[model samples]
Target: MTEYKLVVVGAGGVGKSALTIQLIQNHFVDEYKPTIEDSYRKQVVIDGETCLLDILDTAGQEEYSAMRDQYMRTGEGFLCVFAINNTKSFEDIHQYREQIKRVKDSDDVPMVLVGNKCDLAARTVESRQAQDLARSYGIPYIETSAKTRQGVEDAFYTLVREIRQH
Candidate 1:
């Protein structure tokens, strides 16, 4: 089986950990707590091919930004996430993408822009806007609701597929 190192990044409280946990365990977490750093391993079958994924859930705090370079260097692919209900989180994605490109020293890295918290009734960031931003960066954009499990698997699977292609 092939192995991959994937990283999940976003501003604090944007549901990065929620999405990761949901994908790996199929459960939803109700409380909001910031993540420092956590890693998970899972065996996933994609397109009939088995693979091992080492998922690094990174802390979104600004202080942890200094550690992102090392994380960026080690990761094979990344999930740049934002909450649809939080406009600032949505806007911060540009910086995350740029950081990945800078640390990896390549603009063609495999990545996906993830819009989380899609289950919320009120959303400040429209899907069209996020899609447009993703298009501008030439990366795939997906919306997910960790609570509802909507698009969660697709987001991770799509990134893994992209990584395999890369």
Candidate 2:
């Protein structure tokens, strides 16, 4: 077995904890406050490899900006998550990508773009929008719902898969 450290990023209220909880516990947590205190580890066999995924939830805020660089520096890969219903969250996706690249000092960072909260009413951000951004940004994009756990498994698993090759 091998260890893969990954970080989840995006603006606040995008259900970062909700996605992680669903992925690990198969349950959804409503109204969670994002923080670095929520670090997670899980063991699983995916793609014929038994691996340990060390995941961290980086607090998304202006004050946490300095700490995010430290988080990105130590992380092997990233999940740039955004809420599907929040257009504002989608717009912040670009900064997360650039910040991670700047901290890692590599354009080819192992990362996955995810849109969570698909279970809710879709308003501003849609699948095509995310797809277009991913296509132009040259990364993989997935639509996920933490409540129903739709695409939750594939999102993180994809990042692990990406990190495995990287």
Candidate 3:
């Protein structure tokens, strides 16, 4: 089976952990404890091919910024996440994209721009704005709700497809 390494990144409280957990475990977590660094492995079939997915859910804290390079280096693809309710989180994604490019030493890295927490009643970042940003980066944009499990699978599967295509 083929193996793909994916990294989940974004600001704290942006549902990066929630989304990763939802994708791997199919369960929604209510508590919001900050993630330091967590890894999960799963066997999944994408496009009728079996593959091993190794996911690294990195810490979103500013103090962990220094560790991002190492994570970026190991990833085959990335899910740059943001909360729809948090504009700053969405705005901060450019830096993550830049870092991924620099660390990976390539502009052709596979990635997906993820707007999480779409189930929230109030949202600060609109889908159009996020879509425009993703277009600027030349990557796909997906909205996901870890709470309601909406678009959660699509986000990860899409990135895996991108990785395979890359």
The deviation in Å at residue 109 for candidate 1 is: 1.0
lDDT of 2 by residue, 1-166 (tens): 6888888999887988888888878888876765764788889777888888888878765468888887679899899999989998999999998999999999999999999988887667878999999888777898899889899888888999889788
lDDT of 3 by residue, 1-166 (tens): 8888989988888898899899899899866878889999889888887888888998887688888887679999999999999999998998888888899999989999999999998899999999999999889999999999999888888899889889
lDDT of each: 0.89, 0.85, 0.90
Query: How accurate locally is residue 88 in candidate 1, as Cα lDDT from 0 to 100?
Result: 98
The predictions' CA RMSDs to the true structure, in order, are 1.0, 1.3, 1.0
Q: lDDT of candidate 2?
A: 0.85
The ten-residue window of minimal lDDT in model 3 covers: 62-71
* Candidate 2 runs further than 4 Å off: none
Question: Backbone collision count in every prediction?
Answer: 0, 0, 0
Please list the residue runs of candidate 1 whose C-alpha ends up more than 4 Å from where it truly belongs after superposition.
none
If ranked by lDDT, best first, what sequence of candidates would result?
3, 1, 2
Instruction: Tell me the spans in candidate 3 whose CA falls farther than 4 Å from its real position.
Output: none
- Candidate 1's TM-score reads 0.96
